[PDB]
Ligand binder design. Sequence first.
Ligand code: SO1
Ligand code: GDP
Ligand code: MG
Ligand code: MG
Lengths: 816, 197, 158
Amino acid sequence: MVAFTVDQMRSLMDKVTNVRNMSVIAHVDHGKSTLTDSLVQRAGKSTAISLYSEMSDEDVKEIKQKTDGNSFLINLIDSPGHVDFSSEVTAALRVTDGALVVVDTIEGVCVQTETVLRQALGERIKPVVVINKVDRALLELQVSKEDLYQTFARTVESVNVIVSTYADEVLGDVQVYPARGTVAFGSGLHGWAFTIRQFATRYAKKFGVDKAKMMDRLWGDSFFNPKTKKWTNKDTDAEGKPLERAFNMFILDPIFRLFTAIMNFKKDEIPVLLEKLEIVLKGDEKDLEGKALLKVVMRKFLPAADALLEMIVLHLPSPVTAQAYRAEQLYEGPADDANCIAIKNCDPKADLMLYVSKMVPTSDKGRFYAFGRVFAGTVKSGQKVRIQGPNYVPGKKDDLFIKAIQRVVLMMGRFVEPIDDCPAGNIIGLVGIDQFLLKTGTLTTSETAHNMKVMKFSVSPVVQVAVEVKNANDLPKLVEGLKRLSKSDPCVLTYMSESGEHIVAGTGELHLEICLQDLEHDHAGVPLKISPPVVAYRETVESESSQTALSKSPNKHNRIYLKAEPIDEEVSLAIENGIINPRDDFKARARIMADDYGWDVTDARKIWCFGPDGNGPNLVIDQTKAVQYLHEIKDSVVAAFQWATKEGPIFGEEMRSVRVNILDVTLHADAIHRGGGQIIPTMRRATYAGFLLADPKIQEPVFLVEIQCPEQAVGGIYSVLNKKRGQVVSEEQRPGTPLFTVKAYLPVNESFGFTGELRQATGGQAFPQMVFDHWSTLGSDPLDPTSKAGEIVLAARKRHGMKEEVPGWQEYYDKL
Amino acid sequence: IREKKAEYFAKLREYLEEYKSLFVVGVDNVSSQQMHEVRKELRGRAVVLMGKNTMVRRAIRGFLSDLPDFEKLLPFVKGNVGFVFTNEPLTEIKNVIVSNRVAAPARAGAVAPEDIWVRAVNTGMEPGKTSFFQALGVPTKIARGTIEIVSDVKVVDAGNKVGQSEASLLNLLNISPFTFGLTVVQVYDNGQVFPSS
Amino acid sequence: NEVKYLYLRAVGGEVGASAALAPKIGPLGLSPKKVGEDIAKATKEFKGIKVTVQLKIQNRQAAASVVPSASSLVITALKEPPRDRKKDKNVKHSGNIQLDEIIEIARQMRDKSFGRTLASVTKEILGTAQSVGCRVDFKNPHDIIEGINAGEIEIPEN
RNA sequence: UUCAUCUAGACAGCCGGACGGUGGCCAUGGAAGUCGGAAUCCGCUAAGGAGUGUGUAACAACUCACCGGCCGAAUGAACUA
Ligand SMILES: CO[C@H]1[C@@H](O)[C@H](O)[C@H](OC[C@@]23C[C@@H]4[C@H](C)CC[C@H]4[C@@]4(C=O)C[C@@H]2C[C@H](C(C)C)[C@@]34C(=O)O)O[C@@H]1C
Ligand SMILES: Nc1nc2c(ncn2[C@@H]2O[C@H](COP(=O)(O)OP(=O)(O)O)[C@@H](O)[C@H]2O)c(=O)[nH]1
Ligand SMILES: [Mg+2]
Ligand SMILES: [Mg+2]
């Protein structure tokens, strides 16, 4: 359409049965941004594009879809093929119903084609397949006709294997075939494509032959057998010189003949064959020679803008006919609520349900139009709307907001059209919202409107790098950009680490480098540098403090004797998940340690405090016998324990799983001589001595990572794991599919470049997800400088500006 | 070495004047599992003895002085042949021997006797196995969650050895045009050798 | 009714994991839970000692039938207090199973064996026990074989 | 120089077999001859290692020790200078 009219497109939007909002998915460089471009050519990130297509009554009749009218409006998304942008395709998949799977004829069904197709089948989206770069097959590989037919056969067979392995048991017949017309073939770059249904229609105009069952004879083993006039069904040897199949003889043969003639420059035969193939000429296109003549003559004799759009109109369902079998899975609530059934109804008069998915920029920093698909009811310019949160609990007050809409917008090829209203089953942008909705969610007008799906994706943020602005005065700009992209890009994850560093996370090296380039140049606007994240360890003990650690006060009147012990991992877990809570009461919280954790009820009753932060997993226990003034130094001892559990004596990191047992104290009688200034340093030095005599050790955070890789790539999984010290936990196979699932504990230390190493070992087929699980004790000493735990401490000391050697246990210990 | 050879000679003597009749069984292409099965079957009825043809010939030639009858058995020890002695009706032993057979699978390299075919059948094979069919050019479609060959296809022709991909698909589809078992060249019986027939 | 055929080696009297059950049987629409319970039932007496488990898929039928595994029979006869994986790694086996018991294992193996004599099948089972390394009648299984060879252990050929 | 094989058929070459108990015991997340420790058994045996290598996540599947078919008179190994 050449900007037909704003109100004409408003009417087309109001039409909710001749509109198709589908997405073209393929492998990287398989030719989706060229097929979509060739579709938008006659139409005058993922921004929907609009195409106008007329259509005939015969092939509106030849449609298994509830429709009325004769003209169609295509809203097309160009999803990205890279595996690092595997969520920008998932968002379009959620917003869309049809999937044009481009498959390259040369390369076949590659890793990313399989990935995006398995995603579409997870969303139960019906795929239609187009085989691209047939011109490449015809000029590079020089397939004659049967090699090309067999390549088509293999491509269709592999796509059918994927769909038959990953089709949920609700459709079954979603298997793709050219025989049914769900597979096209053409050259996107050159501008031509065909379906065997289109050829079986092009033939009736000259042969009077039937079209109903010739469209399943033009594919497969079916032989017209000329000189005998009979559509035989097997080779039969042709009584010598076995003859060719209908596909090669009828569809490919004119194509290959035009190719041969126009590329061989047979100017005495080009016009004759061109007239036989009923093309039109231009005043100067007649003076077009090879390598572009064939291009234009096939762009005329076989229009891709028609071959693709006809199968899009026919086999790709409309909203009012496709939302039915997808509402039950896009609505976690039960199938027996009005909001649930409204999406199935696709009624433009029910309560509103509009899913913002993409925060589209607006040429202005911080206005952020809200792309989304309407599912139920009509949106209005200035209608009272209710924002829903991705974790919004519907019972009580949660991320529900009571704002409204400012202006409806329809997005186009980078320009916005101001609209006031649009019925259900359509694609529009919401101006005036999304500064109240973090990433995704829904916007409704009902008051019991359970949200629709969180739009889960197969990728996650697994590459983490720390960033910092050089000019510390321009740090507000850094954080402003760092949160202005965390909403624009859906899969980017940013946060503050356990060591005070902005940790930008992403899908892979390429996605991360794109995000970091956006940070450095466009979103923030300030030059910043990137580093590998510092892994925040913990300090702990793995022995029982061979001799008693002793400390004397600065005035020497007070003494502390203690020991250190390795609090068990289960006890520490109970602490951090609240089973043992500081606020709880002794002899009630101590009964749990006694009965269910092996502790002695006396010691569990004699818990002075938790550290660090006042609630951490480290404990201090009074093992002392009668002492005259023990309860007066309690506050000083708990303060010193908080200090010694925040700033450990190895590199100042927080303690974990440390038990301190105050065995004896010796306090001066006068309270003026056992004040805080005399007890806090004494207690912290005694705790440090206990730590450095109870076999000090460090603990590192370990990721739990689960990877969905197939049988062929599980060996690469294992190789990467045992090269990066990973521990194989559990393998499994999903029911019926070949996609494995391997779960493992990978240390955070050896976790940088790990996803890149895994993708290189598995050919991109391994899909990992990682999340911090727990802390593992490093077996090697952290006090020896050259020990495997002993160099991370040295690096921390250098990076923090402290000394190189570690203060030995002879310090913090007063000899007595 | 020579002691083991003498042991074999003595065992041959034992069989030659302990069993009225023997068979000359051809064991070409016969495996060892087949051999154990045959020995198990013939147990009680018959005994099976293998050796080196030269060993057997020299042993016989050295016992000919006492048993000059086996001079007519001597020109039948050629090729992969062994001796199945028995004290039982000829026909029973013959039938059992030529009854124990194995449809040996397609090992790549073996010259295929006759043209291997694949027919338009629902093979009942997990779809993932499509790789083999695509490698052999066998058109297939997934029906009822199983691979189904769409069109008859001559995998290899009569003559040319079964290639590795051909062998893989054949072992997949249980196609095995190799049947191996003991044949019978001649039968010795009471100083009289005669063809099996 | 199509007779499908598959094995496992689940540990004796040890609940079989669904991760080691579903991949094999799962295709032909049967619950990994129920098959695992069947394996446990078929290996009740086999407790501790792994064994093969023939399973005939007769139109989705959970017919667990323990295939006698020579080593499994040998060590279940060894009878050793349950081999507890948790208790100690590298659990050794030293069961003193008597010659009669070994002959019973031999007569439960002869059908699926090739040894000419019941004596020969006993020799096979003794070799399996020797592999296990257990003691037998206060002597090594190899020396028992030497006795049989020299005609000392008169075999009750039944 | 020394030790071996050899017309009871040697070496090389081509071809056939290379099994069963048995997924031997232990472990391993998985380990079926083949990432490891230990044990080096028995039957069928002409012959086959509880395994020489390739291979799988484990399988599988190839391959070799070992024995046979063909050929027919010599041949192999470790050393010395
Ligand atoms: C959604 O993504 C989540 C998690 O899934 C993921 O585990 C990631 O890991 C961050 C770390 C979490 C660890 C625990 C909180 C204790 C130590 C922490 C880490 C080390 O310093 C380990 C991982 C990696 C990060 C360091 C190396 C920067 C961590 C951090 O937050 O500092 O955290 C983000 C927020
Ligand atoms: N010969 C040929 N080249 C093609 C075809 N489709 C795409 N290409 C080439 O592929 C290159 C990039 O493809 P593109 O569509 O942009 O990649 P996409 O992101 O997957 O869509 C272009 O330079 C084209 O020349 C085709 O049908 N034939
Ligand atoms: Mg693109
Ligand atoms: Mg291995």
